[PDB]
Amino acid sequence: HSHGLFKKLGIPGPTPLPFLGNILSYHKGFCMFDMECHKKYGKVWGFYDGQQPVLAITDPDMIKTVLVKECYSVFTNRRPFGPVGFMKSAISIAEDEEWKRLRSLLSPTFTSGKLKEMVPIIAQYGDVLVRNLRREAEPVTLKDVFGAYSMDVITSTSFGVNIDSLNNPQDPFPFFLSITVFPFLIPILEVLNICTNFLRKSVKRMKESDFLQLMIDSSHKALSDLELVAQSIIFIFAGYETTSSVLSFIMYELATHPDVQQKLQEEIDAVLPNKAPPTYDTVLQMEYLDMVVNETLRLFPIAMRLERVCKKDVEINGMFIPKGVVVMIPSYALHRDPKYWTEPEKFLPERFSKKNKDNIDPYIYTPFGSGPRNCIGMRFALMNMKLALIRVLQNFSFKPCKETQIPLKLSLGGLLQPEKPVVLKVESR
Amino acid sequence: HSHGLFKKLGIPGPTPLPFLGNILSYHKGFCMFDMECHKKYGKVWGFYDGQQPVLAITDPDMIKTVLVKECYSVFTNRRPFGPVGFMKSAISIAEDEEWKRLRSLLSPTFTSGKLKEMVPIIAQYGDVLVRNLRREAEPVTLKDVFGAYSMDVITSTSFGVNIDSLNNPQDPFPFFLSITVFPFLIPILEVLNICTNFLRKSVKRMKESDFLQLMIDSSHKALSDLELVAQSIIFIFAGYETTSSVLSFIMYELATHPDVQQKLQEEIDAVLPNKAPPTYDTVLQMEYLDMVVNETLRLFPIAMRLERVCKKDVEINGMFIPKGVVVMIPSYALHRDPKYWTEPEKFLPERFSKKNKDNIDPYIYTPFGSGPRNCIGMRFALMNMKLALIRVLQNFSFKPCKETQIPLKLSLGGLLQPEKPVVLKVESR
Ligand code: HEM
Ligand code: HEM
Ligand SMILES: O=C(N[C@H](CS[C@H](Cc1ccccc1)C(=O)NCCCc1cccnc1)Cc1cccc2ccccc12)c1cccnc1
Numbered sequence A, B: 001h002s003h004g005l006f007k008k009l010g011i012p013g014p015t016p017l018p019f020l021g022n023i024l025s026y027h028k029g030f031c032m033f034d035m036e037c038h039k040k041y042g043k044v045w046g047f048y049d050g051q052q053p054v055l056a057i058t059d060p061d062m063i064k065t066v067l068v069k070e071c072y073s074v075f076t077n078r079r080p081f082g083p084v085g086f087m088k089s090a091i092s093i094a095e096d097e098e099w100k101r102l103r104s105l106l107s108p109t110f111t112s113g114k115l116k117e118m119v120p121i122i123a124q125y126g127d128v129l130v131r132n133l134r135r136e137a138e139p140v141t142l143k144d145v146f147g148a149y150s151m152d153v154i155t156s157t158s159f160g161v162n163i164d165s166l167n168n169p170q171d172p173f174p175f176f177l178s179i180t181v182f183p184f185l186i187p188i189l190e191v192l193n194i195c196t197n198f199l200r201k202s203v204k205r206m207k208e209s210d211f212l213q214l215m216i217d218s219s220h221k222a223l224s225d226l227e228l229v230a231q232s233i234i235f236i237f238a239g240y241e242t243t244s245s246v247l248s249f250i251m252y253e254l255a256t257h258p259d260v261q262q263k264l265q266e267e268i269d270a271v272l273p274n275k276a277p278p279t280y281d282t283v284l285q286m287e288y289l290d291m292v293v294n295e296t297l298r299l300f301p302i303a304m305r306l307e308r309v310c311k312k313d314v315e316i317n318g319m320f321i322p323k324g325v326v327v328m329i330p331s332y333a334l335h336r337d338p339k340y341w342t343e344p345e346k347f348l349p350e351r352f353s354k355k356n357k358d359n360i361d362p363y364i365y366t367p368f369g370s371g372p373r374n375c376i377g378m379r380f381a382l383m384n385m386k387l388a389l390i391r392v393l394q395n396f397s398f399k400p401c402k403e404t405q406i407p408l409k410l411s412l413g414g415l416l417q418p419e420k421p422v423v424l425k426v427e428s429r
């Protein structure tokens, strides 16, 4: 069918098989597929997820045109996910005009000062972590401890609840993607009644009569109860998973690089002497801390792939793109590209130093994306993580163990998840 | 699911059943449904074809906004038909940018002078009709004789072929619409390989090395062989069916109204004395002839329903419409509306007289639609029909028979087709 598209465009790529397209080459994960295609075909290439044509671009100017220059008019939406039901109205899933409203509706949640009156609330949960951390079983599953914290902070910044997750919490947060081959079955399930339930109303209950309160405020600017919940489901998952997952990845690199973990712990002692309470302005000046979370986001991107659906015919940077093609930016392949990073498989936070910050193109390293559809909780995630990295390193040191996977191997599937959990030996001072 | 839409909009209509919506009320045809809903709910009402919300409008200013004012930006497309395959690129089926190109590509086919150098070719096939008509079996199936002619003229104006259809032609030109209830299965069949074949290449053969020649001319302005054929399939079907079907409907009203058939035959004798050959300018001045084809198009519209898919949220004439709603204009219900026509079930061509032409709103009587997506072959159809009505009435008179359905009843399904064919007794002079 559409498998002759890239042939007619003069665009190279792996020859697709009938119906399946190129999905068979995902047997080592799409990152390995993206990197190998990046080396065999160059700056641009096309392939097929089933019968869906995907155009991969690695040129920075062209990437900037897709994510920024032609976002509103052409590349407004990502690949349509489903079946979801009412979750179609979630901001990270909605399209065009409905998303444009949801973005403007939820933008003021993480402004400059909106995060400033969060630290007094976030700081309290930090101690709860150091208390549950101070346990002396003289490794530790870094994910659960970080997940307990990250759930406690996003459920508190969005709504009013604290949860010492030493006991059981209620947040219940895969291997199913046949649609990517055969997605034409999504409209089948949109009427087959396919989707949350416990949380689909547990959130809905919230009346409180602030993310929750800056929404019940609900002129072409309304918000149903399900809409309230649909945004809450996204914010809770993103605040729990993304934070905790990256925090554990950061700790793995700190344990396997004692010089970096030690030089960072020196940074926290100086700027915050006598283990002073982390404020909103002390985080924003620890420079080496910023480099450490930045270099970890390079080697372990949560996206791995950035994508935009072409909505109408375009010619960008001297190349025509038809409607309905998914334009993909292989962030993982670009973050590991030896053409932009020397020894790219190595953990070296000096890439983001004061002098080396200029050599980085902001359209090759895009851990939060860019443009109007970038990560809306980027600054909340950076602050929530850095507030965590500061207090946990002011008190503890982290060290490998016999139950630690070294070198850490990432699930060769479709998730910035490790094969084995990060279990590090925690030591105290 | 979406069945609560019109309830939340304050818009009345028949309460839908699960999954089916309101399709059950089509048991007397959608025209009866449109007329009865027009009388029970007023100027605007909504219903569901399955789970697809359809908004019916009868206000002329609002109809003008949909068909004309907001065509390019909002109401660019009709209901997506399928499964078709390569026929998706046919102009009457394509969407937005692809249709916008196909319209500009095929517009010059029926200009002012483009039809003027057609009459010398069309006139020859007229005689072929009067020859096959002069047969004296002293009724006649009006459709086959008209269909033989209308196929001979559109296959000649578009490509080079004549066909005395006294013998067998090759044009092979239903009752299947489950999709209207359950259309989510269309993308299933777009990959299940569901569609023409004989004609899918019989047309393709055309090389000729003029509709065919003004296309092989095939910069973002190309046309594949299938595209050539896909447009040819539409032009052939429209030139054969629409012409012959309306011609037979016109003859039925002329046979059942001898005063109108006689007054029209007087009109042809005067303007064209001594049965002078019909030219391009003699057709354009027979005024009563124009009224007769106009009044027949009122009682027997080929559309019955005009529809546009709402592509983005709009507020038109003080009413909000969400994305994805099909806006329907019930042409049949409006053509039979006693509020705009006195005794609307009666055949009275004086409604379109010189003085009575002003009382007609051009957005209540829309047999060819209006706006950028109107009938592109309107003037070719009007000329091709009037050129036929002139010569066939210059020689013959048409009269009811025992094998004639009086009063004629239309298929209560979804087609301007009669229940029984128009079989009239043809007499000569
Ligand atoms: C280390 C932490 C995080 C990373 C690396 C990350 C990464 C990303 C990326 C790559 C995108 C897509 C950008 C694009 O396609 O151009 C995105 C979007 C988004 N992020 Fe995050 N994210 C993080 C944390 C969070 C948090 C804490 C929230 C809290 C609400 C959040 C909410 C969202 C939403 C709602 C979107 C979709 C925005 C839209 O569709 O308009 N993210 N994020
Ligand atoms: C009595 C004869 C005819 C009638 C009553 C008729 C009626 C119509 C109507 C109601 C529409 C839709 C307009 C709208 O939705 O606003 C249409 C569209 C169209 N007609 Fe006809 N038609 C006739 C003959 C023809 C002929 C002879 C052709 C020859 C090519 C033709 C080609 C088309 C095409 C291609 C479209 C689609 C235009 C587009 O999608 O841009 N029609 N017609
Ligand atoms: O993942 C698909 N689309 C997605 C859009 S839906 C997806 C559904 C979902 C809901 C609840 C839990 C888990 C998944 C969704 O809401 N996620 C973002 C919600 C929270 C979050 C996570 C991470 C960074 N910030 C924010 C596009 C998308 C948006 C934002 C961030 C993303 C990060 C990685 C990958 C995709 C991303 C997809 C996959 C296969 C086929 N088609 C579509």
Ligand SMILES: O=C(N[C@H](CS[C@H](Cc1ccccc1)C(=O)NCCCc1cccnc1)Cc1cccc2ccccc12)c1cccnc1
Pocket: B078, B079, B080, B081, B082, B090, B092, B093, B180, B233, B234, B235, B237, B238, B242, B302, B303, B375
């Ligand atoms: O009929 C559907 N859509 C249609 C768009 S496809 C339809 C498919 C088809 C191809 C070949 C033979 C018969 C049908 C198509 O090409 N016709 C127009 C082709 C010739 C023609 C006929 C009549 C007046 N002029 C021109 C919308 C549409 C366009 C133009 C004129 C129309 C007249 C009456 C009704 C619909 C019309 C539909 C039905 C159910 C569900 N969804 C969609």
